Amino acid sequence: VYKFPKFSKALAEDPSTRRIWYGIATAHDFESHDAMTESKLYQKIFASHFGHIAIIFLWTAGNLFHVAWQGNFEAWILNPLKVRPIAHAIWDPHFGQAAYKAFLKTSSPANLALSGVYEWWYTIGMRTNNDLYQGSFFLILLSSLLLFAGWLHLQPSFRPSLDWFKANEYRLNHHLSGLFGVSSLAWTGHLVHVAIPESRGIHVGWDNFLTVLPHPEGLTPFFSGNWKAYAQNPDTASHIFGSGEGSGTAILTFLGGFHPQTKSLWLTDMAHHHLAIAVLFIVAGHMYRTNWLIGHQMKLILEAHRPPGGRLGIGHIGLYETITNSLHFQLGLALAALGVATSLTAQHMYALPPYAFLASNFPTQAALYTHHQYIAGFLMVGAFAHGAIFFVRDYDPAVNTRNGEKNVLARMLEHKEAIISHLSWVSLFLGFHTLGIYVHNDVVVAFGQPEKQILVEPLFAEWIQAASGKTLYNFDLLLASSNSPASVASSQLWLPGWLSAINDGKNSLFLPIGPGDFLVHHAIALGLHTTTLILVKGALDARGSKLMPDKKDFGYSFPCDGPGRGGTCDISAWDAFYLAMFWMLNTIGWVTFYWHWKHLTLWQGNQVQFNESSNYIMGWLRDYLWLNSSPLINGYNPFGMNSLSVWAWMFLFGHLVWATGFMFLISWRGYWQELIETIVWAHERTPLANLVRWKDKPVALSIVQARLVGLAHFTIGYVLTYAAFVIASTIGKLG
């Protein structure tokens, strides 16, 4: 009991089990560790980043290897619409003969792959279980590279200084140009060279790539400027993916819409997209100043941006030193951007499927959308939590203030009451009225008179759909009109492909919407606004309030301020994150429920079921949950079991973890300390067990630890039960 929390002497002197619990939960809070400097902080974060990237690459290599070894990738190539992809084999000694038989796929029990990796790897030009093995080998090599780099940059002569870590202009130039633009350029190179011929039956491997021309003219049009030659003769409308029948020779085209066979974006479209992105990012990577006297100094840009009339105070003068010296501001910005980006991925990979035959893989579509939306919610909550942490421990009012006047960030704490009050008003407005309309529909339909329902046509959103070319709402607006300047401009470039895809009932591109979509979008807006209210209130009130005008002196995470002055439960900024996690889970649940029910009705064909029953709550409860839960719960019955048996077990497991979270959330400490004391007395006063005594005094979990454990149980149960439900329902309903 003197060397586990090596980074904290205060914890290492704790005689109780709290030392072990807090040793885990404070291991990555490097700024709070004993004998801590900024240089060591940045160096340790750098090495941890290297180890993390190595972990990511090892995970991808493992996926590749297990698909290559125990999957059916090669068989799935020849029949992608009937063969179900296999993730990996199963060896579990607890299986009975029935479980072995039900999970048996080809040669061994195996799990279907819901990650969509088969379609992704097939699209980028993989046709052999030896191509996957090469990828796994290369990724393990890259992981070894990253681990070696992480070790190296902790060595004495190779540890970077604070100036290098805080060199904003150099890092931005390189990140933007090199990372984004050059990675897009290399991806365009791969796309063209390998993927484009492989979709046309020509194999371009690591042997015949220096001799197989990606285009017949071969780099002559690029240098000659005849760039149109790369767009001539695109893939026809009768092209079979992976075969030369009906193929073309173009490598960079505008076609819009989807491939007629795979129902996915054209490979030549994506290569052109990545080439354009590469050029744009390489250009944008020269903005900031470096050792060659030209570029921008972002301190000057920030300082010079003060509106002349004066409404943002003194502008952004103190923001450069604020962001540079704080790792929580940057982390919050990065997390917010990543959350928006992965929300974008979720919202675009279902409307615009980019991988061949992924549109017809309904379980993987649902799994991908749900996974990315949950990750998005997590990232957004993390961004706001780290903003609150920045307020608590990194914000300096003196830097953000010049002669009494406050800069753009410090002014957010002046009208903080206005911001919180208006967030509260919007949340109450949306909640009151969305619930009112939903309950009105509930009562009116229940009384047998559905005609008295309040159904608001989402005209604003249908207006947007018509603007992009959907001739379904009779708006004749911008691209629904053939005479508008928006249509004549692109009538020869990408409208014929785009219009043919947007005006198709079998796509998810701009799904038709009705009053149910209106109501559920308002519910989503309410969830977003309430989660934002909780997080913004916690961030702004992090440094203090009327109930605790010295909250900054207690840190980001503390249990409370006591029992007097009223009370003081959940007063810290960490508690705001803790409360907003429930609202994030609820909002993501609403979003994923809406998406999954809409797509289940679209795939099954009974879109009238959603359009009618989605306007009232009992419609949701009866036709989504109760209706589609039947295949899942019958994964094993007193008569037998199916391959969905694991999903029913995970369903029950998620319910159990959810209710254990309920334990940890409803029942607080103090009730568990006295019980533990009784147990301690019982152990101390019993023979044959007095010979064994604890080294750490058993104590109840701390208030903050109990909140974290209850939140973890709640979230894990939530995620597990919904994943089981969505996957099993899709599989058991749509064959």
Binding site: A68, Y133, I140, S143, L147
Partner: peptide
């Protein structure tokens, strides 16, 4: 179907990546 040699050398290379991982783990200190 991959051969025994392919899986074996991948396992051996994985071992090398493991020794590199503990070296990074031990260098990040106890």
């Amino acid at each position: 179907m991959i051969y025994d040699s392919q899986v074996y050398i991948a396992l051996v290379i994985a071992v090398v990546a493991s020794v590199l991982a503990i070296r990074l783990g031990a260098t990040l200190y106890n």
